[PDB]
Amino acid sequence: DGKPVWAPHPTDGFQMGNIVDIGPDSLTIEPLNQKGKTFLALINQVFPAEEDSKKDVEDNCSLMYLNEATLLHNIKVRYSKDRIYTYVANILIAVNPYFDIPKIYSSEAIKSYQGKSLGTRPPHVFAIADKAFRDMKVLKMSQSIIVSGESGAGKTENTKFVLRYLTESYGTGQDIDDRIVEANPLLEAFGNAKTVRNNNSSRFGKFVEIHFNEKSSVVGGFVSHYLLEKSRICVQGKEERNYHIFYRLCAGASEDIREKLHLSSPDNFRYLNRGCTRYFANKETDKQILQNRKSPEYLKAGSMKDPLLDDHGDFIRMCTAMKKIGLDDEEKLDLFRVVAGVLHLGNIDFEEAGSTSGGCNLKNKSAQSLEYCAELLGLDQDDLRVSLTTRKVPLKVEQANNARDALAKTVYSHLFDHVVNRVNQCFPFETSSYFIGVLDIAGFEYFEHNSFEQFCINYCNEKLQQFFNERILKEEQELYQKEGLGVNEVHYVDNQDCIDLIEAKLVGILDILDEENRLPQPSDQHFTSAVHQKHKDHFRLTIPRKSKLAVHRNIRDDEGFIIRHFAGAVCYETTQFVEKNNDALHMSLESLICESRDKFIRELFESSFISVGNKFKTQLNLLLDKLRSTGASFIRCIKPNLKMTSHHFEGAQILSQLQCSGMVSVLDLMQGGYPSRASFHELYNMYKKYMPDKLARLDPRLFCKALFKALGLNENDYKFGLTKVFFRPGKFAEFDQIMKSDPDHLAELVKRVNHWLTCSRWKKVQWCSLSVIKLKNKIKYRAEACIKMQKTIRMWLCKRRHKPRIDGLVKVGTLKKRLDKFNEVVSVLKDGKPEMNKQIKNLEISIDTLMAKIKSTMMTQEQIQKEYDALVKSSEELLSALQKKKQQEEEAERLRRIQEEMEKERKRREEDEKRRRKEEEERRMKLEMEAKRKQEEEERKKREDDEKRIQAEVEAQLARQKEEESQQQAVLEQERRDRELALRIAQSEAKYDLSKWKYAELRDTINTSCDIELLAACREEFHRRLKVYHAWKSKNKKRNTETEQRAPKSVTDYDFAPNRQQRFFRIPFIRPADQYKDPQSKKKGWWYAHFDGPWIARQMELHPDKPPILLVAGKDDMEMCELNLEETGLTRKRGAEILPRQFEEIWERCGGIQYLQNAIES
Amino acid sequence: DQLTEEQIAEFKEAFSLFDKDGDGTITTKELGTVMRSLGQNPTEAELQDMINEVDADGNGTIDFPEFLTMMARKMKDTDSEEEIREAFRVFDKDGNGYISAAELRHVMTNLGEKLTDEEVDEMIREADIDGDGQVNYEEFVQMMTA
Amino acid sequence: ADQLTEEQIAEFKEAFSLFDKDGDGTITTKELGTVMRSLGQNPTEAELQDMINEVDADGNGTIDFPEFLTMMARKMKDTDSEEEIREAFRVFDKDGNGYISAAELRHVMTNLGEKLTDEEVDEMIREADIDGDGQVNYEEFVQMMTA
Ligand SMILES: Nc1ncnc2c1ncn2[C@@H]1O[C@H](COP(=O)(O)OP(=O)(O)O)[C@@H](O)[C@H]1O
Ligand SMILES: [Ca+2]
Ligand SMILES: [Ca+2]
Ligand SMILES: [Ca+2]
Ligand SMILES: [Ca+2]
Ligand SMILES: [Mg+2]
């Protein structure tokens, strides 16, 4: 009974299906694909579908229907056509394709997007970069392209493309533009690794700020780093590698380099062989790497393939890169020396002495590694094992290995810091005006076992998602309300509770954990317990016994917790948080190392509990301060599948990301919101430099007004607010066109605006004269309506005053001519003359007496009707006496004929009399009917006044109940997000019970069963389900389309107010007092309505210029109203109630009996 | 002109009844006012015009063949009752079947050829025109013409 | 066809902007009177009060713009549209010679109150003249009107 729709699905996310049933809270949908399969699907999860599946639109806000399902389908169609990038009104969804799409990243593509307003070209990341540059040149404030997405979504690659565009379209050909991009592979080698979710996994979040001068030319760059994951350097997972540099060094070092650095196969270092040891290489590169490098496990298993990375090739690439960025061979050897020093420092394994005195000693095998580490890091053997064996308090084996790993972590952290500083000084800058800074943070990541690094990464994801919420939803709705545009405000899931949970003071997790560390006896269990103590009832933090996944249920209360991030819930084992908090490398190590003899080591470290968490909190607060100070353009990268396969697009994961990231809410907001904003004053002064003096005399908003038609723009595009002028989505090619500063273009627009304005100054006056003429002719209209008024008033005055007599004396004149006719036959007869003579004189006495009585004075109609009523029986007595005389006088030929024709004429008279009496009595009884109905509505008004019912308290509690229900709806949505993330983790690891009845039966058992009470609740249910379905068609409305009027607006909009009588009614669709005041202007004419019983039965709408649209129940009920008569308030409307048969008259002149017969057939 | 014979009979009949002079002539001043007697509906302009053309001879009185012609071209161009009801519904505020009696009084008195108080009182009382219950103008219209 | 097009409604919005001198959005019989008597007609306060009470939802005396469009609404004749447009042109054309000079536009602009210089009215005629003969005719009005 309609068009197919979208429905929930486990794997493809959302699926295509037709509606079979209309339940109370579900639409029982039939998946067409798997015929026979069937489920109930909630109201808030069934969505309308696109007319044709093959259409793909570049901007989703230009879709017919706007909702999550159509967004996911648009992406799915575009993805298979090799167009991964998509728009949502200013936000670019970039689905990562997992394969090098050709002919779109070459310089010829970068050559096209320069200066093109987004929308004039296919969506692409370069268009976001160019919009960023355009808004930085025009608005003259810095901007940040906040790339966000999950771990494995395509953040680093999109950042590289942004930098490549910004340096190859807006550089000047120096070395700096080349360096800004070629710096990325070096940092890539030194700070990225193979996670489970990604092969090139950014373990540090960077903010590459391409600084610009006043002249909008690149001046340099500045690359910052936040939270280099430092636990990897020492311990690595089963299928994870350390940072690439430990491997590119091994697989790429030459013969002399191998001899100097004392390298070997990666399995020979403890810091590496605990994880994946296999290089990355293609066939040619695999053959290229020398056999002595490859570990035996690499022979046993083989190289893994990534579309972009290749270990040996990457080492040659980064050698060229270091040479380009100005790293001489000496600095290169220094970096590789520190790397090899970290590598070796793992092999020094500490043994305990034979006596249980805490003697920390070393093996015989570590002796060679001891010398190698001493030489590499510029240290002395004596100093080294004195520093490590004791602290000189002797240590234990656990503390000794902790010490080794602490030194390794500190050295690698400072090595990364020095690499970043050298890269920064590759492209220096003193002063600049603006910066375009991409932000590639390590995205959300969750694993089977999560530790402090995952917790902080997800915390940074939390803050950046809160920033996105504030920038695109909170700030935008605040601005919209300041302009009061009446956009239907959309509610977003605020993450502020989770931020407050992590970063607070005396109640926050990080500060509670600092408190834990500053106790003399630190304890992980104590920190977990304290967090469960200070956050007893908080919504976000959950003891894992109350989890969804069974894996985390094993961890009991005082060892871990689960936090519902925006992306979902992640179980953080609080094992070893207390140690990973600390940045206090003991004085032993710092002393050990500052007296190293190598210049490079000293230059490294020349740059007491100090929490990593508080340091990271400060870092992120500073980063967010920079971001808030700037504008922002957003890219949402989406990972298609959790299996790294190309050309595979799993709906469930992508839709979980879309709901988690708030992109769905942004679509629900931009369904009516205006992406492009602008100040009136900016335009006014922007054109005043060229726009002449006279045209400026307009109001600034007037001159902006005439501007938009010089372009011939549509009035469905803009909506002027208080201090801003807006533009709908999908209209950028004209907004940036308005922002053009071309003097010839501005002169052309000046001339066009001048002409449109002088046109309007014609139009105003001409239409004013037409309005004057139309009012004058409305005067003529009302004057002549009133003259017809007066005509009828006077005629009816003289119709009850004279005309009654005229009718009565028409009857009397009939009788008089009849007496004239009788007198002849009276003379004809010859027996009993005298009594006939008495009769005839009596009758003529009646005649002339009544003629005098009428002509003399005024008499009522009823009086003369009585008089003629008597004289009728007088003529009857005449006739009867004539029959008896006939029976006693013989004039056969004369009398038989004459008398019988008198009898016939009398009978025809009497038939007329019965007819007229019936006519008049029916008219009277009709007002005996109407007057009673008018008194009925008056008495109903009186009863309503006497009742004095009050519902202010009722609605007062109803508002609170609605707010509470919204709260539980948000809670249910959060629980759905949590269960979706849990499923993702599981996938990664591997008297009348009519409430049940259908809409179907109800429509059928409404149209057959005559068991009274059946239709009590049947009609009631069927109408309740109908309200639910109209609600579903109301929330899911085509945006360019208006609402559906199945009843006049007056009837449905009386809802401000809260029997078998076949009450008929009639209401204008538009009340003629509101004729031109209907912005909808959709349905016009008379809404006839038969209400039979508690619910509508039949209806009708004669449009002014259309054939009729009849309905009836048990058949067309989708255009018949569902409202109860009382809600219609038609009892409270005056004169709506109508005559029974008047409906049935315009009914039958419009196929009444015919449409009824059709309903009988149906 | 041609017309039904019974209607000519009624015309002669009404002409005869109200012959106060008794010489076979109707004086116009009452003639037009009672000429309204039949459902034909003249204005003040039309009654004025027929006075002028009847008094064009300067007599001030009429005779029945003239009156027959009078009513001939009077009925020849007459207003449809639907047009009357259109005029009634011009003033209907909300299309609710009722015009509030004062608005109605305002219409008759204020607009056009002024109509006097007594007629509107005849409306309010005799014509079932409730001041509280605004006239249901269809009902009036009916009773007005029928 | 009592309803109007959206474009007709917008151009009437401009017209009301000319009635609504102060821009408050509401007008009482005073302004209707001043402008209408200025533009040649002679009404009386009684029937303007009648029309207002016809389109005064609150009976306050002031007329909102949608009520103003509604007060225009009428069961017109099909020929009445051309009839009233020609009466409008004659309102613009005092002599009724079918062509407006600079002087006639001058006078009408003065009466409605928009302050114009004698070069501006010449510019008005020259911009409204598609045929460019120097003075405006009727189908030129219509093509200006809908435009
Ligand atoms: N536009 C693109 N074209 C081709 N491959 C891409 C693109 N974007 C991402 N990738 C793929 O993504 C992988 C790296 O993902 P990355 O961007 O490093 O994730 P993250 O930024 O989350 O660390 C690479 O193997 C690369 O092939
Ligand atoms: Ca005003
Ligand atoms: Ca008002
Ligand atoms: Ca002229
Ligand atoms: Ca011309
Ligand atoms: Mg990354």
Residue numbers in the entry:
A (entry chain A): 3 to 393, 408 to 623, 639 to 1021, 1074 to 1141, 1165 to 1268
B (entry chain I): 3 to 148
C (entry chain B): 2 to 148
Please give the exact wording used by the authors of the publication that reports this structure.
Myosin VI is the only molecular motor that moves towards the minus end along actin filaments.
By combinatorial usage of the three datasets, we determined the cryo-EM structure of autoinhibited myosin VI at an overall resolution of 3.54 Å. Notably, the EM density in the PB + ATP condition clearly indicates the presence of ADP-Pi at the active site. Our structure reveals that autoinhibited myosin VI adopts a compact, monomeric conformation via extensive interactions between the head and tail domains, orchestrated by an elongated single-α-helix region resembling a “spine”. In the autoinhibited structure, the monomeric myosin VI in complex with two CaM molecules forms a unique “head-to-tail” architecture, in which myosin VI ties its “head” with the “tail” through the interaction between the N-terminal SH3-like domain and CBD1. A sharp U-turn between the LAE and SAH in the tail makes the head/tail interaction possible by bringing the CBD region near the head. Certain cargo adaptors such as GIPC can release multiple inhibitory interactions and promote motor activity, pointing to a cargo-mediated activation of the processive motor.
